[PDB]
Amino acid sequence: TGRVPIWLVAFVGGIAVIGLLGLFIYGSYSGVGSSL
Amino acid sequence: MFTLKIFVYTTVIFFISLFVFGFLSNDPSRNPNRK
Amino acid sequence: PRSWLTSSHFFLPFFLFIGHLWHAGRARAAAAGFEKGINRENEPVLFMRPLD
Amino acid sequence: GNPNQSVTYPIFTFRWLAIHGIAVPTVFFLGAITSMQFIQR
Amino acid sequence: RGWFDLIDDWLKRDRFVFIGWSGLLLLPCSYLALGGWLTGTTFVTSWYTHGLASSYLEGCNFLTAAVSTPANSMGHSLLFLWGPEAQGDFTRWCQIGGLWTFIALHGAFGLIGFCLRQFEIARLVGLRPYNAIAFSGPISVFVSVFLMYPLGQASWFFAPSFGVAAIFRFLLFLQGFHNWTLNPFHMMGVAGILGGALLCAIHGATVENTLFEDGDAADTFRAFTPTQSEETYSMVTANRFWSQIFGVAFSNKRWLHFFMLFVPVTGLWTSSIGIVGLALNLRAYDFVSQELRAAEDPEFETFYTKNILLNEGIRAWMAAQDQPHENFIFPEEVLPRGNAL
Amino acid sequence: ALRTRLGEILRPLNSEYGKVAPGWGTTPIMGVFMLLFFLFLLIILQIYNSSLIIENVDVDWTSLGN
Amino acid sequence: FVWSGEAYLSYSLAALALMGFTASCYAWYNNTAYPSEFYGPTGPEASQAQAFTFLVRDQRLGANVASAQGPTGLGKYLMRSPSGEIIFGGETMRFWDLRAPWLEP
Amino acid sequence: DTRLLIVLLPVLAAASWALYNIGRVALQQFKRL
Amino acid sequence: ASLWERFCSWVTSTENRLYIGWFGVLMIPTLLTATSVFIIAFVAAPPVDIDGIREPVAGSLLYGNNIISGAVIPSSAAIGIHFYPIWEAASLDEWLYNGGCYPLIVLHFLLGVACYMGREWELSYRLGMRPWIAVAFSAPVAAATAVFLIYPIGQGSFSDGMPLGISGTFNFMIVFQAEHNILMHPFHQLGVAGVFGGSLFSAMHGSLVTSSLIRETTENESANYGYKFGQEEETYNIVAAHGYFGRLIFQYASFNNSRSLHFFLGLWPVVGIWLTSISVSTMAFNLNGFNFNQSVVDSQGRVINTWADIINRANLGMEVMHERNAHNFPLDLA
Amino acid sequence: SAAGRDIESTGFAWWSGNARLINVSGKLLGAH
Amino acid sequence: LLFFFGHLWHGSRTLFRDVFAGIGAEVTEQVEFGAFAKLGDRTTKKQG
Amino acid sequence: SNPNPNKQPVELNRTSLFWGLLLIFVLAVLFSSYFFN
Amino acid sequence: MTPSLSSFINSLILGLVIVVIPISGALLFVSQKDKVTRS
Amino acid sequence: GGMSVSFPAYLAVLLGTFVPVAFLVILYIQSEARKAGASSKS
Amino acid sequence: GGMSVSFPAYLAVLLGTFVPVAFLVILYIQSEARKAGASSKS
Amino acid sequence: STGERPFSDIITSIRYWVIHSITIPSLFVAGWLFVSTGLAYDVFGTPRPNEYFTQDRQQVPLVNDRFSAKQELEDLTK
Amino acid sequence: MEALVYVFLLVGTLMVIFFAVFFRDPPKIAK
Ligand code: CLA
Ligand code: CLA
Ligand code: CLA
Ligand SMILES: CC(C)=CCC/C(C)=C/CC/C(C)=C/CC/C(C)=C/CC/C(C)=C/CC/C(C)=C/CC/C(C)=C\CC/C(C)=C/CC/C(C)=C/CC1=CC(=O)C(C)=C(C)C1=O
Ligand SMILES: CCCCCCCCCCCCCCCC(=O)OC[C@H](COP(=O)(O)OC[C@@H](O)CO)OC(=O)CCCCCCCCCCCCCCC
Ligand SMILES: CC1=C(\C=C/C(C)=C/C=C\C(C)=C\C=C/C=C(C)\C=C\C=C(C)\C=C\C2=C(C)CCCC2(C)C)C(C)(C)CCC1
Ligand SMILES: [Cl-]
Ligand SMILES: [Fe+3]
């Protein structure tokens, strides 16, 4: 129909916010700066 | 020193029995718009 | 595990007391009638005598 | 509902430039900060 | 037509974001200060400045990362990229500490550009200029803690560094070394900020509580259009409620909202007057009546006298780590410990 | 309105209220002098700050010495 | 009372707030319904095991562990309770009402 | 220098896809005004 | 018509100068004995052994103590959280040495603001209005429960609670941040964003009302004289103050619904002080703040200090010097 | 018959849109 | 520092002299969005 | 030496007195401990 | 003649050259697009 | 048995109180006497 | 190099002056504001 | 209500996702290669986690001079 | 000697609290 819904563009942009913040909590328990 | 414990517990029960028997005496009818 | 079980059981039952203050307020205001606001045709303050 | 089929509209407005000053550094830096935490010492 | 009158027509035109003549000062300087913090918290270290790793590149999160203050070794320098300290080189200018004076000078010229913006909107739409006046509180904290506090002190080193945990040093830095809390201008400021947080909470939650039944739905947020002539809440009932609960109550809605302007701003302006005096070590450290007495009586003790010993714990333990250029090589026997820990 | 012997000799100084020069006037002459004064103020700020160390100008306390 | 659906919720939120505050102080003070071998030591008995494990160590260095002559003039290891019981001294005199199954023998 | 053009090559790939879909319509705007 | 209903309709009468309702039968005698003991023990209390180490602290106006040093001192730590009223003392001055005035003020003050909170409900019932100003007062009441009751519950004695004085609050904050790290706690972090944020929105909303008033007044007189009290019309253009702030940031960053705007004033500081009052009470049971001490290490394993270590060198220096002779063992309450 | 799944069928908005089950006892039992 | 505020008050006062009693009735139709091309100019009002 | 037209009276209501009596007292509550030192 | 002096005069040119671009960029953007009935 | 404080500060507090306290009572009484002169006996 | 005088007497003179001085300026300003309220703007 | 193309009729348009379902990854990937090919350490002066200390320099590096800090920071690393 | 000053200032600001509640300017309406 030539259109994306408004709630869909906030959904797949909403998972990536949880996705980027999910890697920021994992990266605080691993790698440099994680007391390991 | 016991006489203060008799006097405080007179006063604490007096305002508690005014509290319990006050809210038991039809408190949701003390509004406006009827009675 | 005591320091999680006691700390989170200030987090839940303090908030569970706050919603009691929300709902003891709202249920007695809905049963009386003024849960959507003050009635503009007769507000009860204007039919009272003033303070002094 | 339908897409805006024929009405004219400018594309490179100043609201385009004001967003891309704060958005194009954001999606550059997110992804730079994501690559920082796979870095092992 | 004209030439200068042309640029006034374009810059003050109506768009999504407004530029204005203040936008030639605001929109570059707000961009390089808000963006200059975000690229030094992300990448730029502080290892050659403080001996501290503080960026997201070398293993810090959002709390413990900052653009740190430059050095004691530079000492009040403006630290230009083209300057005599870090001539031409961008990587040395990040390593000396020159991003701090990139942010705090663009921040001090961006807050000019935002307060000139609040003059330019209110003149164009035709309002009164009481938002640039209320912004003079936030200007007078940035001009007196980030600029007038380190300029009186020794260097730019003793300034607040732009970061979340680096501020949390500076609160405990002014407790141990300055007894900031006992300063009566700061105690004028706590009652201005906690008074403004009261007035935002107690006025916002009494006009959501004494409001007219304007709609018919269960929620009341739908019962208001912006352009209505009538009052959306009852002033007489909210005056009646606080006259009997508290004892005093406002009777003037017009004076009420000025009191929400005056209580945060004249709290924020009074604590700014004290930290200007804290740059010169004109501090309110000690009560000399009680230091003569506690030296002449070894059983006189108050919470003030306990607060002085806590300051000598802060100033003697942190000094080997906070100011490493001084080379404080305090042994473990001479720093003031208490008993058993 | 009282007119005195001093108010009569100061009369043409408080005379031409609102008697401006038309159009833009000497505003481009003014904007050069405002720019040069600001350019003067960045020089002596950087001389004081030792970001503009020039020859035979020492900003030490030992400048006024023996 | 008020007889409505929002009312009967509100009676039960105040009751669950009373149980939730009580279940916190179970988890912080009790070591019999919440045993110490599973939940860890409690707030008091961690502070009383430290006074016990330094009552042991300095007794093993040959001190008379009573007549300690602690630094403020009170008991360092062993002290007297306000009701007159022999308790552990130090900061741990506030937790003197501890009943714990490794010291009650 | 050689790793600078590894970073900017997805940026050059980003603007090349942007100037494929807009270069007909961005020519409309600059010729309009 | 009854002998009780004629009394029961006086207590719940709105004709009094101050409302004296059924919660006011509890908060009037409890606050007046939390006032009459606070005013007397600020002037003329004897020095109080707070720590139970037989060293008294003199915090009343007779014993020196200008009012940014005087305090109603907390109880003895030998007493603890034991119930210590007057009749459980051998004499009244023996009750004053152990700091009996602090639980007599603070159990009556806490029971008084808990019935102030019900009284703030109670006039919103008899006046016929929406009742949730009791909910907005539940943020200071919880915060006055957190420093006064729940922190003595979790940390043992009543001496760990906040002293009733100005310099006692500064001593309470330094000792707290030594042992609990409240500055790096993410719920105190939200509370100072509801304290700075609440102070922002007071200075923001209070500005945009007073900068968009319609002139029902003259030039030389005061501006506030143009709002006749109890009028029907609004005294300020909401549409002009929205069109101001829609030009300042952008158009849809500003509430031209003044009811959703004013709810956001009642949500941002009240939820923030709800999260502070949790944080001090969860740190009362020693769920402390974040501890990023010695996290950044290099490849050789040498510890690189970050900005949380320079906080820690402050946090350690106020750890060894608070309670300077009350510790006998190396760990603090471990 | 069927009732209450909108804004102007009960008065409550979607953020309060869990409180359209007060006078609806069948959906409330499946909610518990 | 205190004289920086009073200059900022007096510079607010000498420009905004005609709105010191309060705003008039001409404000309501010149504020709402997208009515004019140049903000605060009633000669631009942008119609058809 | 004509009569002045620019003279104007000063007002102060009872609310402004009670704020000013509260402010001058509380600044004397605050600063007395520091003046006495 | 001093390298600390000549870096300041080179900053005055580099302050001018980069920030003549919003001087001209706010001048091309108005003589191509302007208001309809104004000054 | 004594507390050595600053002896001019008794004058800094009490003249610091009673000079601006008397300034507001000067302004308040004439404001109500102007109301009493204008409303009554006009 | 000094003159030992009575230290409460600085409060006996200056409060002994500025409390009855402020009493008369309270009474005088309201007396003319009642004249200004009655003669003018009646 | 201003005259330009609205925001939410851009985000929902199919040309918007046909143009940058790639350039939101192409800035994410360009940010990834800035911090993984060693460019983020080099152009901002941040040390690598094996480049904190030095075999000749076991102590912490701090700047001592002000005007010859270019000569000092050169002799402070390697 | 100086505790008389603090008790006078604290009671003297507690009277202004008393006089602002009960002796206030009464906000009558406007008809
Ligand atoms: C029971 C709760 C309580 C009370 C009454 C106070 C009261 C006070 N605090 Mg305090 N405080 C508290 C809890 C409390 N605090 C807590 C939990 C903390 C955090 C740990 C602090 C942290 C804190 C700091 C850091 C500071 C204060 C300050 C102050 C003073 C001015 C407050 C101000 O400007 O705020 C706004 C005030 C209002 C909006 C309303 C006015 C309320 C008045 C002033 C209360 C007066 C109380 C006093 C005992 C008189 C009671 C009269 C009664 C006996 C009849 C005031 C004495 C400041 C100070 O030192 O000033 C002296 C200051 O710097 N407080
Ligand atoms: C033969 C020529 C000659 C010479 C040798 C001097 C010599 C001097 N002039 Mg000078 N002057 C001259 C001609 C000359 N003048 C002429 C023709 C004019 C035009 C009328 C001026 C106008 C002028 C001004 C306006 C000033 C001088 C100053 C000075 C002194 C500079 C050294 C100093 O202490 O500055 C130290 C001062 C500065 C470096 C000024 C920096 C101020 C910055 C730019 C702004 C700071 C405030 C700002 C609002 C920021 C606030 C934020 C805060 C938090 C930091 C020195 C004595 C300055 C002076 O006397 O100060 C003591 C000064 O302010 N001159
Ligand atoms: C057993 C508990 C219980 C029950 C059955 C109810 C039932 C109800 N409440 Mg209530 N409430 C409760 C506890 C409860 N409440 C508590 C504990 C509080 C204090 C916080 C409140 C405060 C409250 C308010 C303020 C309001 C209600 C309302 C309502 C009604 C609709 C709820 C709704 O739409 O929310 C839909 C759900 C949401 C919008 C989601 C909210 C999500 C919150 C903010 C975050 C939760 C954080 C959580 C701890 C962790 C989440 C993890 C995170 C990572 C996602 C309904 C009758 C409304 C009403 O009056 O209707 C008549 C209303 O306005 N409640
Ligand atoms: C024996 C004793 C007493 C011992 C105690 C000793 C002791 C603790 C002494 C210290 C006491 C003390 C007062 C210390 C103060 C410290 C100090 C230095 C203060 C300086 C004052 C100061 C900061 C001046 C600067 C100016 C400034 C920023 C002032 C802030 C104002 C402030 C603190 C508070 C005002 C906020 C407040 C309480 C608002 C309430 C508003 C309210 C409920 C209004 C009523 C109302 C509300 C409505 O919502 C509506 C709709 C209507 C219609 C209505 O009417
Ligand atoms: C036991 C039951 C509960 C009783 C509680 C009693 C508390 C009463 C408090 C009254 C304070 C009145 C202050 C005068 C001020 C006064 O009365 O002003 C009166 C004023 C009236 O406002 P109006 O609506 O009349 O305004 C119209 C005029 O301004 C028009 O020009 O009320 C206010 O401005 C808001 C009051 C804010 C709250 C007052 C500040 C609170 C801090 C108090 C300081 C405490 C110091 C303690 C030191 C020891
Ligand atoms: C200094 C410098 C510079 C530059 C600057 C800039 C340009 C900057 C930019 C910047 C940018 C452009 C960006 C950055 C950053 C960003 C970011 C980093 C973002 C984001 C993130 C976030 C925001 C986080 C988180 C989150 C999310 C995800 C969402 C939701 C919410 C939250 C918060 C959770 C110059 C050139 C001048 C020169 C010199 C150097
Ligand atoms: Cl111990
Ligand atoms: Fe408002």
Q: What are phi and psi of E163, to 5 degrees?
A: -170, 170
Q: Token match 């430059």: residue?
A: E70
Q: CA-to-CA distance for I164 and G98, rounded, in angstroms?
A: 29
User: Residues E317, E337: contact at Cβ < 8 Å?
Assistant: no
Q: Whole-angstrom Cα distance, residue G10 to residue I132?
A: 14
The DSSP secondary-structure symbol of I150 reads I
DSSP designation for P47: P
Q: CA M19 to CA L9: how far, in whole Å? A: 54
C-beta separation of G97 from G104 below 8 A: no
Token pair listed for L25: 């007292």
Answer whether D40 sits within 8 Å of A24, measured CB to CB: no
Residues 6+ apart with CB under 8 A from P35: D32, D33, D35, D36, D39, E57
Q: Integer distance in angstroms from the first to the last C-alpha of chain I?
A: 64
- As a whole number of angstroms, the distance between CA B32 and CA I267 comes to 29
Angle (deg, nearest 10), helices G43-59 and G5-29: 0
Q: Rounded distance, CA E118 to CA I203, Å? A: 14
- Tell the residue nearest (CA) to atom 52 of ligand 4: E250
Instruction: Verify whether the Cβ–Cβ distance E42 to D32 is below 8 Å.
Output: yes
Q: How many CA atoms lie within 13 A of I311 on its CB side?
A: 29
Tokens of E335: 């720093």
In our burial notation (b when 16+ CB lie closer than 10 A, e otherwise), range E41-74 reads: bbbbbbbbbbbbbbbbbbbbbebbbbbbbbbbbb
**Whole-angstrom Cα distance, residue I118 to residue O35?**
52
Q: Closest chain K residue to P1 measured between Cα atoms? A: K34
* Residue B33 CA from chain centroid, whole number: 26
Residue with tokens 């009490």: N14
Token couple for C47 = 């039919």
Distance from C-alpha of E261 to C-alpha of E42, rounded to nearest angstrom: 36
Helices (H), chain K: 2-15, 28-31
C27 and G19 within 8 Å at the Cβ level: the answer is no
What is the CA(I189)–ligand 6 centre distance, in A?
21
Sign, Cα dihedral of I149, I150, I156, I161:
negative
CA of E39 to the centre of ligand 6 (A): 6
Q: Is the CB of E202 under 6 A from ligand 4?
A: yes
Task: Give CA separation, E116 vs E121, G70, I199, in Å.
Answer: 9, 66, 22
Give the residue on I whose Cα is nearest the Cα of C40.
I232
Which H or E run includes G79? Answer: strand G78-80
DSSP 8-class letter at I304: P
Rounded to whole angstroms, how far apart are CA atoms E12 and K44?
Answer: 12
* Chain P nearest-CA residue for D5: P13
Paired tokens of I306 = 């970050």
φ/ψ region of E54 (left if φ > 0, alpha if ψ in -120 to 50, else beta) reads beta
Contact P70, E92 (CB under 8 A): yes
Coil, strand or helix at I213: strand
Are residues A33 and E58 in contact, defined by beta-carbon separation less than 8 angstroms? yes
**Ligand 4 contact, E318 CB (< 6 A):** no
Count the neighbouring beta carbons within 10 Å of the beta carbon of residue G83.
9
Q: Which residues in chain I are closer than 8 Å to L11, comparing Cβ atoms?
A: 221-222
Any idea how long chain I is?
334
- Spatial distance between the Cα atoms of C19 and C29, rounded to a whole number of angstroms: 15
Tokens standing for residue I226: 């143009």
CB E216 within 8 A of CB I219: no
Measure the CA–CA gap between E95 and P63, rounded to whole angstroms. Answer: 10
Interface of P with K in 1-60 (CB under 8 A): 1-3
Of the candidates I162, I197, I165, which has an alpha carbon nearest to the alpha carbon of residue I277?
Answer: I162
The strand pairing partners of A3, in sequence order, are P13
Q: How many CB atoms lie within 10 A of CB H28?
A: 12
The amino acid present at K46, given as its one-letter code, is K
Query: What is the distance in A from the centroid of ligand 1 to the CA of I42?
Result: 15
Q: How far apart are CA M36 and CA M33, in angstroms?
A: 10
DSSP codes joined into one string, N5-21: --TTHHHHHHHHHHHHH
Contact P48, E59 (CB under 8 A): no
Greatest Cα-to-Cα distance within chain L, rounded to the nearest angstrom: 54
Q: Collapsing DSSP states into helix, strand and coil, what is residue I72? A: strand
P50 closest CB neighbour out of I251, I299, I304: I299
Unique residue bearing structure tokens 């490794």: G102
The answer to whether E232 and I156 are in contact (CB under 8 A) is no
CA distances from P16 to A9, D11, P22 (A): 11, 11, 11
Is the Cβ–Cβ distance between G76 and G89 less than 8 Å? Answer: yes
Note whether I206 contacts E226, CB cutoff 8 Å: no
Residue P50 with chain D: CB contacts under 8 Å: 41
Alpha-carbon distance of P28 to I44, in angstroms, equals 69
Residue Q21 contacts residue E248 (beta carbons within 8 Å): yes
Q: CB–CB of I306/I295 below 8 Å?
A: yes
Q: How does DSSP classify residue I62?
A: G
What are the counts of helices (DSSP H) followed by strands (DSSP E) for chain H? 2, 0
- By the 8 A CB rule, do I270 and I140 touch? no
User: How many Å from the N-terminal Cα to the C-terminal Cα in chain M?
Assistant: 48
Q: How many whole angstroms separate alpha carbon P41 and alpha carbon E210?
A: 59
Backbone angles phi, psi at E256, to 5 degrees: -65, -45
L10 reaches E (C-beta below 8 A): no
How many residues make up chain Q in this entry? 31
Instruction: Find, among P71, P76, I313, the residue nearest to E47 by Cα.
Output: P76
Question: Which is nearest to K39 in space by CA: I58, E126, I213?
Answer: E126
Contact check, Cβ <8 Å, E290/N3: yes
CA dist B16 and H22 (Å) reads: 78
C-alpha distances in Å from residue M38, one per residue of E17, E24, E126, F54, P73: 21, 22, 18, 52, 59
Name residues whose C-beta falls within 8 Å of residue I198's C-beta, 6 or more positions apart in sequence: E196, E197, E200, E201, I265, I268, I269, I272
Question: Resolution (in Å) of the shown entry?
Answer: 3.3
3-state SS class at K38? strand
For this PDB entry, the determination method is cryo-EM
Query: Which residues of chain P form beta strands (DSSP E)?
Result: none
| Sole residue written with tokens 């790939």 | H13
Q: How many H-runs (helices) and E-runs (strands) does chain P carry?
A: 5, 0
Chain-centre distance for alpha carbon I305: 35
- Cβ(L24)–Cβ(Q15) under 8 Å? no
DSSP string, G4-23: SHHHHHHHHHHHHHHHHHHH
I297 in D contact zone (CB under 8 Å): yes
Chains A and J touch (3+ CB pairs under 8 A): no
Task: Classify residue G62 as left (phi > 0), alpha (psi -120 to 50) or beta.
Answer: left
Residues in CB range of P14: below 8 A, 6 or more apart: A2, A3, A4, D3
Structure tokens at H30: 């600059």
List of chain E residues whose C-beta atoms are within 8 Å of the C-beta of residue F49: 76-78
Backbone angles phi, psi at O40, to 5 degrees: -75, 160
Are E125 and K27 spatial neighbours (Cβ–Cβ below 8 Å)?
yes
Q: For residue G18, give both structure tokens.
A: 């009373």
Query: Cα–Cα distances in Å, from E265 out to E119, E131, E138, I206, O8?
Result: 18, 11, 8, 11, 40
Cα–Cα distances in angstroms (integers) from residue E275 to residues B8, E187, E188, E247, in the given order: 50, 12, 12, 36
Q: Which residues of G15-34 are buried (b: 16+ CB within 10 A; e: fewer)?
A: ebbeebbebbeebbbebeeb
Q: Which residues, at least 6 apart from E247, have a Cβ–Cβ distance to it below 8 Å?
A: I18, Q20, Q21, Q22
Residues near P13 by beta carbon (within 8 Å), at least 6 away in sequence? A2, A3, A4, D3
Q: What are the backbone dihedrals phi and psi of residue E162, each rounded to the nearest 5 degrees, phi first?
A: -75, 95
For residue G6, give both structure tokens: 């929002």
Which two three-digit tokens encode residue A33?
Answer: 């700066």
Task: Give me ligand 4 centre to Cα I148, in Å.
Answer: 21
Amino acid (one-letter) located at N35: K
Instruction: For residue N20, count other CB atoms closer than 10 A to its CB.
Output: 17
CA atoms within 13 A on the CB side of E38: 16
> CB–CB of N28/L12 below 8 Å?
yes
CA neighbor of K40 nearest in space, from K29, K25, K48, K30: K30
Q: Is P34 annotated as a binding residue?
A: no
Closest CA to E301 of I58, Q18, N22: I58
Q: Report which DSSP code applies to E52.
A: B
Cα–Cα distances (Å) from A30 to D40, E53, P51, in that order, read: 8, 17, 20
The closest of O21, Q13, E293 to N13, measured between CA atoms, is Q13
Choose which residue among I166, I172, I279 to substitute to test ligand 1 binding: the one with the highest number of ligand atoms within 8 A of its C-beta.
I166
F10: helix, strand or coil: coil
- Ligand 6 pocket, mutate which of E31, E32, E42 (most atoms under 8 A from CB): E32
Instruction: Give the residue among E89, E87, P64 at the shortest CA–CA distance from M2.
Output: E87
Residues 1-31 of Q with CB under 8 A from C: 24, 26, 28
Ligand 5 nearest-atom number relative to CA E250: 24
Q: Is the CB of Q9 under 6 A from ligand 5?
A: no
Of E7, I145, C46, J11, give the one whose Cα is nearest residue M33.
Answer: E7
DSSP letter assigned to residue G80: E
In this structure, are residues A28 and E61 in contact, taking their beta carbons and an 8 Å threshold?
A: yes
Query: Burial letters for M3-37: b for 16+ Cβ neighbours within 10 Å, e otherwise?
Result: ebbebbeebeeeeeeeeeeeeeebeebbeeebbee
Query: C41, I321 in Cβ contact below 8 A?
Result: no
In terms of DSSP H, where are the helices of C1-52?
Answer: 2-5, 8-30
Q: Kindly list the residues from chain L whose CB atom is less than 8 angstroms away from the CB atom of residue Q12.
A: 25
DSSP I165: E
CA distance M9 to E61: 41
C48 vs E82: CA distance, rounded Å: 75
D36 DSSP assignment? T
- CB neighbour list of residue I88: distance below 8 Å, 6 or more residues apart: none
Measured CA to CA, the distance from residue K44 to residue K38 in angstroms comes to 7
CB G43 within 8 A of CB G28: yes
Question: How is E164-176 classified by DSSP, letter by letter?
Answer: HHHHHHHHHHHHH
Cα of Q20 vs centre of ligand 5, distance in Å, is: 6
**CA–CA dist E5, E119 (Å, integer):** 19
**How far is residue E232's CA from residue E213's CA, in Å, rounded to a whole number?**
9
* Residues in Cβ contact with G104 at an 8 Å cutoff, skipping those fewer than 6 apart: none
Residue whose C-alpha is closest to residue I67's, from I166, I163, I168: I166
The answer to whether P26 touches D24, Cβ cutoff 8 Å, is no
Per-window interface: I 225-264 vs P, CB < 8 A: 251
Paired strand residues for P54: P57
CA distances in angstroms from I85 to B1, G11, I74, L15, O4, listed in the order given: 11, 33, 14, 42, 51
Q: Kindly report the three-state secondary structure assignment for every residue of E251-308.
A: CCHHHHHHHHHHHHHHHHHHHHHHHHHCCCCCCCCCCHHHHHHHHCCCCCCCHHHHHH
3-state DSSP call for residue D9? coil
Listed in sequence order, the residues at least 6 apart from E325 whose beta carbon sits closer than 8 Å to its beta carbon are: E71, E72, E73, E157, P62, P64
Closest CA to C3 of G98, I286, I276: I286
**Positions of E strands within chain E:** 66-67, 162-163
Cβ distance K46 to M38 less than 8 Å, yes or no, reads: no
Whose CA is closest to E107, among E160, E171, E45? E160
Q: Take residue E218 and report the two structure tokens written for it.
A: 């269960």
Between chain A and chain P, are at least 3 CB pairs below 8 A?
yes
* CA distance readout (Å), E87 to F30, H15, P70, P71, P77: 34, 34, 8, 11, 18
Q: Check if the beta carbon of residue A24 is closer than 8 Å to that of residue D37.
A: yes
Single out the residue of I181, G35, I151 nearest to residue C2, CA to CA. G35
For residues D12 and P4, give the distance between their C-alpha atoms in angstroms, rounded to a whole number: 10
Gap between the Cα atoms of E252 and E238, Å rounded = 11
Q: What is the largest CA-CA distance in chain K?
A: 52
The Cα G20–Cα I69 span in angstroms is 38
Distance from C-alpha of I255 to C-alpha of E208, rounded to nearest angstrom? 15
Q: How many CA atoms lie within 13 A of I266 on its CB side?
A: 21
Kind and range of the H or E run holding G88 = strand G86-88
- Which helix (H) or strand (E) is G78 found in, with range? strand G78-80
